[PDB]
Amino acid sequence: SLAHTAAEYMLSDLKGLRLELPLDRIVKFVAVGSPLLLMSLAFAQEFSSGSPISCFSPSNFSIRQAAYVDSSCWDSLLHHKQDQDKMKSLWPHKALPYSLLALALLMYLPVLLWQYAAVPALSSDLLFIISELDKSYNRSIRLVQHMLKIRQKSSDPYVFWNELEKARKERYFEFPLLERYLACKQRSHSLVATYLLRNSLLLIFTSATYLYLGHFHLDVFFQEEFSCSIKTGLLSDETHVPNLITCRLTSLSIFQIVSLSSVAIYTILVPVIIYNLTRLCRWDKRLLSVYEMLPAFDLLSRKMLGCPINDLNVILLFLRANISELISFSWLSVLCVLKDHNIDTVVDFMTLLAGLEP
Amino acid sequence: SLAHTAAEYMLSDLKGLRLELPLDRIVKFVAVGSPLLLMSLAFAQEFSSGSPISCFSPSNFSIRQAAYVDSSCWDSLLHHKQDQDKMKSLWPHKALPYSLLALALLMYLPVLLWQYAAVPALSSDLLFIISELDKSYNRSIRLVQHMLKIRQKSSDPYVFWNELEKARKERYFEFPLLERYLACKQRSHSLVATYLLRNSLLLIFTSATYLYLGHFHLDVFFQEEFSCSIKTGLLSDETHVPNLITCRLTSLSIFQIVSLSSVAIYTILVPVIIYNLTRLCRWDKRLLSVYEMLPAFDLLSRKMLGCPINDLNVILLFLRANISELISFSWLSVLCVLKDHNIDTVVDFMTLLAGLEP
Amino acid sequence: SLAHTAAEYMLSDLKGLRLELPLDRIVKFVAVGSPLLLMSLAFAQEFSSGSPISCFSPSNFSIRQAAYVDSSCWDSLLHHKQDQDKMKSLWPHKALPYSLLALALLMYLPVLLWQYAAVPALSSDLLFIISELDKSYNRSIRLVQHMLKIRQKSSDPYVFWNELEKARKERYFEFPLLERYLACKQRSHSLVATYLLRNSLLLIFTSATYLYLGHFHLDVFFQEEFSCSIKTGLLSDETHVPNLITCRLTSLSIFQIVSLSSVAIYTILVPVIIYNLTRLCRWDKRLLSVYEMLPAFDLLSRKMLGCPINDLNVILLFLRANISELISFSWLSVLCVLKDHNIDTVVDFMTLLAGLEP
Amino acid sequence: SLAHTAAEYMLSDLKGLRLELPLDRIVKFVAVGSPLLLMSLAFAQEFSSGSPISCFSPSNFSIRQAAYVDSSCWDSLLHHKQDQDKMKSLWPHKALPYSLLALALLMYLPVLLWQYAAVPALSSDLLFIISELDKSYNRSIRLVQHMLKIRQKSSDPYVFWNELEKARKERYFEFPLLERYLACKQRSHSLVATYLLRNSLLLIFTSATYLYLGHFHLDVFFQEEFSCSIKTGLLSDETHVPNLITCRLTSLSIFQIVSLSSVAIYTILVPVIIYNLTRLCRWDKRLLSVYEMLPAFDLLSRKMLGCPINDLNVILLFLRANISELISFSWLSVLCVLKDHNIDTVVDFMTLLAGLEP
Amino acid sequence: SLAHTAAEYMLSDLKGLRLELPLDRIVKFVAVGSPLLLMSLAFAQEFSSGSPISCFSPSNFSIRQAAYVDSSCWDSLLHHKQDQDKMKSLWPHKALPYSLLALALLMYLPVLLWQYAAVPALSSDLLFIISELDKSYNRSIRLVQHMLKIRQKSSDPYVFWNELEKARKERYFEFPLLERYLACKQRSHSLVATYLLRNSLLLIFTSATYLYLGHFHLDVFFQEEFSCSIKTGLLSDETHVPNLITCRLTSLSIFQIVSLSSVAIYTILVPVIIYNLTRLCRWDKRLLSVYEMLPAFDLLSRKMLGCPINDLNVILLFLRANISELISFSWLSVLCVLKDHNIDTVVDFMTLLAGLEP
Structure with a gap:
């Protein structure tokens, strides 16, 4: 079988x-x-x-x-009905699987566009971002051994801020490529078109399927018998039945069950893609509170203004699914405790010695 | 075959x-x-x-x-019975495997919800907990070589308590992330919903199966013969039998055996899920006696109050199954001897030299 | 095929x-x-x-x-026999393979219980015992190089006993975890239940098979012909044979051969499981003579008292099959020579230089 | 196919x-x-x-x-022959492949016994012997560099015997575990039972096959036609042929060819196992002349006395097949030159410098 | 299919x-x-x-x-021909594939003998020879760095011969195991028997195939029709045709084509094995000229005397096919230039610096 x-x-x-x-x-x-x-x-x-x-x-x-x-x-x-001579044809019965396979091959076009027209650029962008971010980590790990002895013998604020403010005016603190790259992409508006077309194409495909089941179906649905004619041509000069009656089709039950299954699955499928469309109509700020304190993640939450239809929204949505791979899956995910401060200074005094990992 | x-x-x-x-x-x-x-x-x-x-x-x-x-x-x-003209249809006979496969695909939905809506968060939480706990061990192993010579030359209590009380007021003794994390999760109530829905969905599925076997079955169960009609349409202008009698179905025995097997397996299956539901209605304290003496495990047994429907109960139940993997499978499991004290001090005097492992 | x-x-x-x-x-x-x-x-x-x-x-x-x-x-x-109207049914003939596959799936239940209810705990226990025993070896190998020069230049007894008695009052000689663990398990009585149920379940399954072959079989065994009736319903208003005679079944020989094969294999299989049951009714002391001299193995032979139904018996039986894997397969297995002493002192004087292995 | x-x-x-x-x-x-x-x-x-x-x-x-x-x-x-009423049955014709597959599964039992009841002990014994023998080599290789300069500057006999006699009274010369182990096994008589039963089982199986082909075969061998009866029951009240004549079987040629092939292969196979039995009735001394000069191999040829039915004979027979693996395949196999002495001293003077290998 | x-x-x-x-x-x-x-x-x-x-x-x-x-x-x-009553049988027609498969299984016996009776010893011998020869190389490579500075500053002959003659009386020059092993094998005569029997067995198999096609074939080759009889037994008391005429076989063309193909392939195959036999009747000396100058290969060409039926001939023939694997595929194969001397001394003066390889 194919x-x-x-x-x-x-x-x-x-x-x-x-x-x-x-x-x-x-x-x-x-x-x-x-x-x-x-x-x-x-x-x-x-x-x-x-x-x-x-x-x-x-x-x-x-x-x-x-x-x-x-x-x-x-x-x-x-069907050569006696009611002049309206030959009602029964092409849906022999066209069911043809239309099924055509619909199956049609459903995959949005996948084709989403996988060819947007995957390479997005993959390159994410490769660049992961390279710069793991560099951002290994240029920041060097702070946990400078803070193992000088961090101990001083009276808290004037070493938790004196070195932090010195690090604040230090190169490792800022990530210039991040703000410049994020600006150069947030001003762009090319990737959202692929998303909207990939959804609208399947939407109009579902509408076309509904029209197909509404016009060509729902008419021959309870008819299981029709009368044909054999002398519809040169057979006329023969002595047999003038009208070959009762050509009974055997697959009416399969016809009905496949029609109902198709219509039901698409009725239950329609709202999901509408929800996917509505996902892009709002700015997500569920965990924006913890993003504004981190150095690099402050810029991500800072550019939250204006109409939300931007490539930055799509980039953020695809990043939140990738924010827990192996290294970004860290204190970030562990930071479920600040969603409800000088005490936290001595709490993170111990935590910086707790994030030694290897 | 599919x-x-x-x-x-x-x-x-x-x-x-x-x-x-x-x-x-x-x-x-x-x-x-x-x-x-x-x-x-x-x-x-x-x-x-x-x-x-x-x-x-x-x-x-x-x-x-x-x-x-x-x-x-x-x-x-x-069935065109002579008793007017009630055509009794026999759709269950041709719908048996269709309903079987629909039920088979329906049974897997609770697995889908339990595996997509709760697995990632729980897996991340357990990954964090295992990381912090093996760190808790390798920050506590350092006590077995400080206690190989100073532990020997002193008169028992004033080195089994003098160092222990010094260790009591020492950082390695407490596990602050443990109580804070356990609080931040025990106050949460999100994971229990997934469990209750995953059980109730299969329960209502079993109820629907019972209704299906009660209404559409149990009616055509001893009927193996029915009379049909061929001139139920344009066949009427033909000279043959006016009523095609005795359409005998061959799979009545298979019908009966599959119906009885389905009803019996679900009758024997129902009580297990009820037991699973009742597992969450009580606080488990079978081994709470040994948990209250250990430093880290004291907090686990301390928060045993109020109504037991909390995420902490589910976390504990899934932890007891994982408490014997490779490292938590230790003296913990060996501690089957204190379920029936200054003598234990000299017993654990020797045991601390016995838990050297590598 | 399934x-x-x-x-x-x-x-x-x-x-x-x-x-x-x-x-x-x-x-x-x-x-x-x-x-x-x-x-x-x-x-x-x-x-x-x-x-x-x-x-x-x-x-x-x-x-x-x-x-x-x-x-x-x-x-x-x-069978509508003329002898009133006792319809003898022939359901065993169509139920042979159904009962065969049900019996096949039933036979595997004791394996399920033995593999789920006892395997993890036993495997963990044996993992602990193998860890402690290879540690027992590598803490005892250190004696073969202390005895390469001091072992030579002394008059036999006062270095074969002076160091041995010094080693006797030395920590490496005794294995405290061994006696404590062996006690904590020999007092337990949980694993023997799994063994007895796993045997009794297959025993009662064999008894049920015997009952099935005794009641539903052995009655239609030489009958290859029976008379049916077609007008056992609405066929009565037809002109044909009133009784459809001689419905001959073709698989009588297969019926007989499968019945005899099943009964014979189970008759020949029954005594083996009875022997397995009787294996646990006695204490095995075939090689207890050599076990009482070895330091660690002395405790194994020491706790041989009382009724033999204990978890220690099962542990010993499963250990004797694992006593020859790669390291316990040593002088232990080589010690087939002391089953028939100051001469052995100079024999083992040379043997300790012979067990250098790597 | 199975x-x-x-x-x-x-x-x-x-x-x-x-x-x-x-x-x-x-x-x-x-x-x-x-x-x-x-x-x-x-x-x-x-x-x-x-x-x-x-x-x-x-x-x-x-x-x-x-x-x-x-x-x-x-x-x-x-066959309802007219000659009273001796129904000769034709069950061999339908039982040919059943008996064939039963014989096929029966043939493998001696392999089962030889592979389960004797393989583990023999494999362990050979593992011990190979460990001790490669140790015997690497404790003897150290003699080829002590004999590269002291071996040169002396007048032949008083360095080819003075060091050899010094090595004679030296520990490396003798292999005490060898004689003690060989004694402890040559006095044993357990492994020969497995060999004799493994041969006798196939012998009695061949005898049973001969009896089966002699009784149930050789009687219906030229009969290709027989007369059956259909009214051997309730068919008697019917008007048809009273005796259904000439039920011709089509596979008579296949019957004959398979019978002749089976009998011929077993006739040609019988003497080989008899030869295998006779292999154990004599002591093999084909190359005993060269074994008596080597230090370790002298003990192998020394214990050649009494009745040859001993485990030592089986061990030697299995060792001769393994005496040429990678290291025992050495001068041993090269020593085909002393099967036809002070000249050999200067011949082996050069050979000891020739067996440097790595 | 099998x-x-x-x-x-x-x-x-x-x-x-x-x-x-x-x-x-x-x-x-x-x-x-x-x-x-x-x-x-x-x-x-x-x-x-x-x-x-x-x-x-x-x-x-x-x-x-x-x-x-x-x-x-x-x-x-x-064939019940009218010509008394010579029933000519047609068993070749139904025995064609049986004889084909028997011949196919028979053809593989010489492979069995050649692969079981000679492969292990030959493989062990070649393993020993390859071990000694790669040792011969890595004990000779050490001469190319001793000849990088002393080889330069001297007047040609008295350093191309003074060191060569010093190396001539040096141990690395000769390969004693080579001549002794080659003698111990060239005097042996066991491996040639396997070769001669492996060829003669297929030769006599081809002769038997020729006899089979000459006697049982070539007689029923143009006969496609024969007359049988149905009343060759108890059918005689019936009223039908006394002689069932014209039983026509359909596979006569396949019979003829398979017979001709079999005879033709064996006629074209016969001379090759005769050539293989004649390969062993002569001593190969195609490249003996270059073998007599090399140190180790001089012994190979030296023992070329007497009747050529020796194991040395077979060893040499199998070595020439293995003389170009990875290391013997060297200057040896490159030495196609000396098949047409003080000039070669300065040519090999440069070549020894050219064979540095790694």
Whole structure:
């Protein structure tokens, strides 16, 4: 089956970076695999089909007179109703899996755009930021051994501030590339377009699916029988039934169940992407209180003004998911205690000797 | 078969931490695999089905006159009883495996919520706690070589208490991050919600399964025969049997055995999750006697007050399963001897020389 | 086939420890694989079954009149004997592999209990004991170089006993954790329960298998033919045979051979587990003579009193299988020469220079 | 096919030791694989069987009247000869592969006993012996540099014997563990039992195979036709042939060829195991002449007395196959020149400078 | 198919040594795979066989009257010719693949003997020789730095011969183990027997194949039709055709093509093994001119006398294929320039500085 190859290349399972949101991953998985699951269920295994169209041939017909009967109607699904001569065609019945696979291949386009048009630049930017930030750490670790003996023999404030103010006017304190780079990117407005188009494309795809199920479906839904004609051409000069009646389709139940499953999964899926859109309409300040005290993280919370549709918002949202990898997963995450000061000076007097790590 | 792929991703077999309880693992395994086992048994291998519906066609019928007979009834399971004209449908018979697979995919949702909404925060918290605790050990091992010569040449109490009281007023004795962190988490009430919802979701799922087996089942349970009609449409202008009688279904025994197996496994499974719920309604104090003497473990047993529904209870329950990994599996587990004192001073005089380990 | 998956997870092939006895392994292998082997042999490969029920339809019947004949009896195995109207049913014939697979899954429960309820504690205990014992060796190897020059230039007894008695009153001679730990475990009585239940569960399972083969089998054993009825319902208003006679089952030979194989394997298997039970009713003292001279092994043979049902007996039995891994496989195993003294002093004078190993 | 799994576990391909003799390996391979080869050849590939029983139904019979004819005789192979009423049964024809697979699984039992009841002790013994022997070498290599300058400047005998006699009364010359261990094992008589039982078991298995081919075979060997009866029960009240004649079996040629192949392979296999038995009835002294001059190997040839049924004989036989691994494959194997002395003193004067190796 | 398993174990793809000749590999490949290729081609894929025997039944015969006709002749291939009553049997037609697979398994016996009876000793010998030869190199490399400054400042002959003659009477020049080992093996005559038997066995196998194709084939080669008899037993009391005529076999073309392919491949294969035999009848001296100047290789060319059937010849032939692995692939192979001297002294004056390699 081609489904094996599709799963082999499509949906088959830098160097540590998380570039895609978990909710985006979930919605991608459901929207991509569900058409494939309906594909596998409808035609294979469960319902051994054989001939999806079944007919009532007259008794006088031989073997492949009736074989022509049965084989000339599946490709010519047309209801010659007596009500003039409106041949109602039954193309949705033979087009169900075709539309399913077309929808499945259509669902993956936003992934293509998000993975080709935005991944390389974002990955390069995050590679630069991780390089500068681990350099920021190893240029700051050198302060924990300068503060193991001089930090002890002095009366608290005039060594917790005298060296801190000396470090304040010292190069290691500031991170100039950080503010300049963050400015040069926050003024940019290119990455938000990819996000908005990647969401709107799947939204309009869902709308098109709704229209497809509303127009071409919902009309032949309780009809399981139709009358065809064999002398719709040169057969007229023959002595047999003038109208081949009751071509019964066998997969009406599968038709109904796949239609209801498709409509239900998309009804339950729609609100999630709307929530994803609304995630970008506000500035996140859940933990802004602790970010304003740290030297490097002060700049992140400082540039919180104006309309929130900026590349800085997207960068921050993707950084919060990567703020706990192996090294940023530190006192930062441990700092759940200052969400409720001269006492903290002697508390961090001991903590600086506690963050020795290796 | 898709079952192979499902087992390949679903149920297929930080860095040492145990995040899931063994009883939870057992109930998950039984509730997830049992629908799959019934799926594999019912349709494949054991009972080579062929055509699950069998009919009695008249003798005059040719090959695929009777093939239409047999193929137009499986999808149109309707009993045209003579008792007006109540067409009793037989959709449970063709919906058994569909409902089975839907129930199988439904059973895994609580696992999804418990693994996405609570695992990262709990794992980070336990990573912090293990880091601080192995630091607590390697800042306490330094006491076993200070007590190899000064510990020997003195008259017992005034070196077993003089140094101990000096160590009592010494920094290594206390663990400030422990009480502050434990307070900041015991006042929190977020993790218990995930536990209660993860249990209640499977409970209501079991209730829904009971309702499904009570309404749609238990009605067609001893009926193996029904009469259908072929001229339920345009067939009426034909000379054959007016009513196609005795469409016999072949899988009634499989129907009954799968229904009884499903109801029995859930009856035997229900009390376990109730026990899991009741596990959180009480404070565990089985070994609180030995916890009150140890320095760090005194705080764990000290905060035992009020209503037991707190995140501290869940943290303690998950810690007791992880209290014997490689290092906490020590004198702690060895201390099964003080569950039945100046003599113990000379007993631990020798024990401190016995816990040299490397 | 599901048998492939079962073999893939069930029965498919710390860090060196042997936790399961070889005889237990053999009985587990035979009791678990034999139902699977009968499963594979009975239904697949050997006997291409097709239709396990065969019937004699009247000559006037068409194709699927007789197909209904053949398909409506396998699921309705009932002998309408003329002797009133005792319908003898033939459910064992269609339930053979179901009971086989149920028995196969039932056989593995004692393994589950023995592997979950006792393995972790025993493994931790043995890990502690191996750590303390290799420490006991590397704190005793230091005696073979103190005895390379002082051991030579003295008149035998007053250096083979003067240093030995000095070593006797020396710390390295005794192993305090050994006697204290061995006491704290020999007074315990928890592990023997797991052993006794793991044996009794398979014993009662064998008894249940015997009852199943005695009641539901041994009755339809020479019967290969039975008469059914088609008008056991709405068929009565039809002109055909009033009683469908001679529904012949084809797998009677397979029935008999699988029944005899099952009963024979369990008759030959029963005494082994009884022997396993009797293994725990006595204290093993085959090599107690050599254990009483060694320092550490003297305590093992010293606590041989009272009723033998103790956790110490189980620990010793599992230790004798692990007493020859890589280091305990030493002079211990070499000491087959003292099972038939001042001469041995000069014999071990040379042996201490012979146990230099690296 | 289960043959794939059997080959996967059974017969599928310490740390250098050779524990099994090449002739034993050959006889094991032929006796184990040949039943499997006949299994694969008889039923699969070569002869596409279909229905191994073929019958002559009367012309009036319909499709599955004759299908019942053909399917009710394979399981009821009984010749109702007119000669009273001796129903000769044809169970060997349907039992050929069953007996083949039973014989195949039976052949592996001696391997099981030889691999479980004797391998661990023998492997431990050989591990000890290899450890002591490579120690014997590296305590003897130190003599080739003491003899590079003192060996040169002296008049031959009084340095080829003066140092040799000094080395003779020196500790490195003798190997006390060797004679004591060899005595403690040569007096033992446990390992020879495993060898004799492992041979006698396959011998009695071959005898049982001969009896099986003599009683149950050789009787139905030229009979390809037999007459059955359908009214051997409730069929009597029917109007058809009173006796269903000429049930012809199709696999008579395969029957004959497999019988002849089995008997021929075992006739050609019998003498080899008899030779293996006779190998232990004599003391091997082919190269005893060179063993009596070497220091360590003198003890091996010294204990050659009495009846040869001892564990020492088995140990020596397994050692001769391992005497050429990497280090014992040395001058020992090179010493093919002393099988046809003061000249050899100056020949070995140069050879000791030739065995410098690294 | 069993062919997959056979290819999986048989013919499926120390530590660098080449133990088998390329021509031997080619002849083994062709003689082993060609029967398997004919096996795969004759019965599978290409010619969908169905029933290899086809018969002309009379028109009055029903379905399985003629099925008995067709099924009772394939196993009873006998031509009841009118010419008394010589039943000519047609067993080659049903024995073609049996003889093919027997020949295929027979072809591998010489490989078995050559791989079990000679590989271990030869591999050990070559391991010893490679160890001594790379030692011979690293005890000779030390001459290229003693000759970097003393080699420069002297008038050519009295430093190209004065040091060379000093090295001539120096230990590093000679290789005593080489001449002694080469003598101890060249006097041996055991390995040539394995070679001669491994060739003669396949030769007599080819002769037996020729006899088989000459006697049992070439007689039924143009006969595609034969007449059988059904009343060759108890059928005589029936009213049908007294002689069942024209049992036509369908695979005559496959018979002819496989026979011609087998005979042709063996005719083209015969001379190669004869050439292999003649390879051992002469002493190879193609490059003996360059071997007589090298120190170690002089002994190899020195022992070229007498009849060439010796183990030394086989050792040399297998060494020439291994003389270019990684280190013997050196100036040796580069020395293609002395096959057409004081000038060479200054040429090798520069070459010794050119063979510095690492």
